[model samples]
Target: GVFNYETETTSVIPAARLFKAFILDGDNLFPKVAPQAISSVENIEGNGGPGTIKKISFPEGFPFKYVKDRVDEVDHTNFKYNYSVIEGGPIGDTLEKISNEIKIVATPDGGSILKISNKYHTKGDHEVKAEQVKASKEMGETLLRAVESYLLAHSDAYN
Candidate 1:
């Protein structure tokens, strides 16, 4: 089973700045923002365009060992980025992969709207639990909030 989900959130930061901070510079910023959850994110292959793979490591006491994401699409012009969880997992036996698509749209007041979509690809006879997905979404948005804070405080960043 493939479970699809979508979430919409608003941010005071402009779309361009937030986009660069989160999409292009995410590997550098993730650990800086939240040292507890993310150990580091490194480019494993390619030049960060389509087909690039990034490895995101976790802290010592976290649940899963680590996870890898493959860059499926990155469109700076449209403020859209998409990726898939290609390796590792607390994903263990319950799931196959998780795919995410995100887009940011600028508003008139220098703010932005975040539109995020996720697909949970389940293994045979397995299903995605709503609680786990909810928890995942919450953790993700919390990181986004941290990024928003980072961009807001640094006027010269990602400009």
Candidate 2:
């Protein structure tokens, strides 16, 4: 019954490799796509496999600050994926709890469809109503476009 607190964002990228560059490969990602927020990603365990935990710290989102331990995962070979935060994210003040899933599926035009969804509980944060969810969805869409354009231009950077 968390229907009121969900947001979905969708984007289409040219190919799965491009998606991997911006989302899968952390070594060449982080600073490239979200330099202002992501400082570093460290895999302390699990040998780059599923169930492995990655600790991600950001440079503080100013008015909002948060860090999260994300787990790297691959599913159905390439059609499914997710970065789940097991701990250390900033969803405490306005959200009682939060979990996010970013999924990708291949489209027929040699492209990929990226989807982002977030589930959160309202903690009496009156401002985090429908408008907030809408804004969040827009933000996700903006980020997708930014990264897609960056990768499209910087084709050689992933190497």
Candidate 3:
């Protein structure tokens, strides 16, 4: 993980509920809500917690057909999770892997802010350009917004 990036996005949803739906239960919740981009997230190893591996599939015409990630850490109390994209995705050509750390923090107004960081590990002599980084960020932001909007519309979800 050499090229590093981080971003913060504000949301109307609370931290814990947002984390539950967006991280913990995202495999089951996202495909139903955002069928346009994500096709499915299937648990391929472990038991849905740290050390688990997930294979995520995208809809047709997306840049990547599928990607796989391994869960590195999960802190429910702190509303934080860490994962590494180890296969497929933006990694196949020049990158070796990508690391992600996502944290959901509560605001006084009952809204929340997502603090996300990423580290890109490149192959020998390979460079990660700005556009490539931006694309990855946009991908994550798309999913975040999709779930946030879904939660806003359905108040009973992930409560």
Candidate 4:
């Protein structure tokens, strides 16, 4: 079975700054915000554009291990980014792939609205547990909140 989910969150940060922090400097800021969840992020291939491959590693004791994702699209002018998990631990074993698309839009109040959409692909006759999916979403939200807080504290960051 396949599952699609979308989430929208608000931040008191500008769209450009949010794009720079989340899409451009994500590899550098991820570990700082949630060190326990993400150990490191590195570009394993490409020139940091579409088709770029990024490897993300989790802590040793985490449930799932490392994952490699390909950047499908990153439109800075539009504040849009898309990527897919091509290989990973549990996902590599139980699912086909996972795709994510994110967009940040400037609001009237000088803030930004972040919209994230995810698609889960499962193998033949294999169904992903709802709890696992829910947990993943919750974890992502937690990480985003942590990053938002971090960026807020460093207001001048990634400007």
Top lDDT model? 3
Off by over 4 Å in 4: none
lDDT of 1: 0.87
Judged by whole-model lDDT over C-alpha atoms, candidate 2 comes out at 0.59
What is the descending lDDT order? 3, 1, 4, 2
- Cα-based lDDT at residue 52, candidate 4: 95
Query: What lDDT tens digits, residue by residue, belong to model 3 across residues 56-118?
Result: 999999888898999999999999999999998787768889999999999999999999999
Give the Cα-based TM-score of candidate 2 against the true structure.
0.66
Error of 3 at 3 (Å): 0.9
The worst-scoring run of ten residues by lDDT in candidate 3 lies at: 124-133
Q: Write out the backbone clash pairs for model 1.
A: none
**TM-scores vs. true structure, each candidate:** 0.94, 0.66, 0.94, 0.90
Candidate 2: how many backbone clashes?
1
lDDT of 2 by residue, 1-159 (tens): 133444444445554665566566754465567666456677767765577777666566543344454555665456455655455554565555445666676678666766666666556753446765665576456556667777777767654
Candidate 1 worst ten-residue window by lDDT: 89-98
